[PDB]
């Protein structure tokens, strides 16, 4: 503490300012917290505060003021779970950050997602976890290729192959919370495919869906 408690207090001020409209003062407050963090030799709180600052910039200045307070709260809780020497709270922080990553992927927000995955990487390369760092790469690849195939005009078979590729990777990793979102997205894709006249591509989707559901049940 000392400097780290000052950082936490400034983060409380920034969240108070964000929950009432003022985006410009919260940015300055987080900049002050970053200047304090450059004086405490941590290199793991400085990065998370820089992520919070850029989150203010991108999310807060535009219409989303409820997804910048989330980033600042995650940064504050990471810092305050470092002035208590707790590694059993960092894991729950990782769990909450990963659940919002999955919700961001499901919704479609690309500005929330980058901040959340940056925070998750910072937490997980500080917790000695690699079953939560391989899922991060799998979800990174899935989100990017999904954004491309939705920008361009590639066929339904390419989208199905993307879904099956990431499903097999997540099954080989064993994550279950990252596979229910994939099942939901595959159900949406199957709804779109059945709408189309194409056959022999819906039986494959249904079989994949059933196999992933059974493996989720077993997992
Ligand atoms: Zn600034
Ligand atoms: Zn094919």
Q: What is the DSSP string of 119-180?
A: HHHHHHTTTT-STTTHHHHHHHHHHHHHHHHHHS---HHHHHHHHHHHHHHHHHHT-SHHHH
- Which ligand number lies closest to the CA of residue 208? 2
Ligand 1 centroid–CA 31 distance in Å is 6
Taking the C-alpha atoms of residue 74 and residue 61, their distance in angstroms, rounded to an integer, is 19
Half-sphere exposure of 112 (CA within 13 A, CB side): 22
Taking the C-alpha atoms of residue 143 and residue 149, their distance in angstroms, rounded to an integer, is 10
Ligand 2 centroid–CA 102 distance in Å is 26
- Among candidate residues 17, 41, 42, the one with its CA nearest the CA of residue 27: 17
Ligand 2 centroid–CA 186 distance in Å is 15
- Which ligand number lies closest to the CA of residue 165? 2
Ligand 2 centroid–CA 170 distance in Å is 20
Residue 59 burial by CB count (10 A; 0-12/13-18/19+): exposed, middle or buried?
A: buried
Ligand 2 centroid–CA 158 distance in Å is 7
The two structure tokens encoding residue 138: 């799998």
Ligand 2 centroid–CA 200 distance in Å is 10
CB atoms within 5 A of ion ligand 2 belong to 157
Ligand 2 centroid–CA 154 distance in Å is 12
Ligand 2 centroid–CA 49 distance in Å is 44
Roughly what angle, to the nearest 10 degrees, separates helices 45-55 and 23-37? Answer: 170
Ligand 2 centroid–CA 130 distance in Å is 31
The two structure tokens encoding residue 190: 């199957």
Helix (H) or strand (E) holding 89: none
- Which ligand number lies closest to the CA of residue 54? 1
Resolution in A: 3.1
- Which ligand number lies closest to the CA of residue 201? 2
């Amino acid at each position: 503490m000392e400097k780290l408690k000052e950082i936490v207090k400034h983060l409380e001020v920034a969240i108070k300012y964000l929950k009432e409209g003022k985006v410009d003062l919260a940015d300055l407050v987080v900049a002050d917290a970053i200047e304090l963090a450059k004086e405490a030799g941590d290199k793991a709180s400085l990065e998370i505060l820089k992520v919070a600052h850029k989150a203010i910039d991108t999310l807060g200045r535009e219409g989303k003021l409820e997804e910048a307070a989330k980033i600042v709260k995650y940064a504050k809780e990471y810092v305050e779970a470092k002035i208590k020497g707790d590694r059993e709270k960092l894991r729950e922080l990782l769990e909450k950050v990963k659940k919002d990553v999955l919700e961001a992927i499901k919704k479609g927000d690309e500005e929330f997602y980058e901040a959340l995955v940056k925070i998750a990487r910072i937490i997980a390369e500080d917790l000695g976890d690699e079953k939560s760092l391989k899922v991060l790469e799998a979800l990174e690849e899935f989100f990017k290729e999904w954004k491309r195939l939705e920008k361009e005009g590639k066929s339904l078979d390419e989208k199905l192959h993307l879904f099956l590729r990431v499903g097999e990777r997540l099954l080989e990793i064993g994550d279950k919370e990252s596979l229910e979102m994939l099942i939901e997205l595959l159900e949406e894709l199957a709804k779109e495919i059945k709408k189309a006249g194409n056959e022999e591509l819906l039986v494959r989707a249904e079989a994949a869906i059933k196999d992933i559901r059974k493996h989720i049940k077993e997992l």
